[PDB]
Amino acid sequence: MAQRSEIPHFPRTAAIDAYGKGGFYFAGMSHQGSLLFLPDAVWGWDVTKPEQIDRYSLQRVFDNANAIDTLIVGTGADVWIAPRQLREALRGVNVVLDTMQTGPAIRTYNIMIGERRRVAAALIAVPLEHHHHHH
């Protein structure tokens, strides 16, 4: 419960800094895994690696999709293209889905965040441990 109070959440931030080792190191402490840059605040996503991005994993995304006009998906180090059905389904929610690498995504986010303010960024950190398994 921390020190009798919740830790400060960054409510709508346009400044992303230090990407790489540790994930997204900005403001105080390293932020790794997957981050949901929402108009409300920068919240944490419960997805660890690519392909885990399923319709059920997008729970909190659809939940707040009313405030989401543009959805930037940062697949980290490699380009994972969202399946046609998933992409088309998001289109049906009127959500402009774009898949990009985190770097250019950071720039594009910084641009559109001031433009429309209706942009949400789902950025996943690079798998520096190269662990994706194999069968």
The domain locations on the chain are: 10-128
- Residues 6 or more apart whose CB falls under 8 angstroms from that of 108 comprise 72, 100
Query: Does residue 82 contact residue 55 with C-beta atoms inside 8 Å?
Result: no
Task: Give dist(CA 51, CA 125) in Å, integer.
Answer: 14
Q: Distance between CA atoms of 65 and 60, rounded to whole angstroms?
A: 8
Tokens 């997805």 — which residue?
47
18-26 long-range contacts (CB < 8 A, ≥24 apart) are 19/102, 19/103, 19/106, 20/126, 21/128, 23/125, 23/126, 24/123, 24/125
Structural contact between residues 112 and 119, judged by C-beta atoms closer than 8 angstroms: yes
d(CA 125, CA 2): 25
Cα three-residue angle 86-90-95, rounded to 5 degrees: 150
CA–CA separation, 129 and 82 (whole Å) = 23
Q: Which residues of 115-129 are buried (b: 16+ CB within 10 A; e: fewer)?
A: eeebbbbbbbbbeee
Structural biology method used = NMR
CA distance 58 to 52: 10
* Topology classification of domain 10-128: Hypothetical Protein Mth938; Chain: A, (3.40.1230)
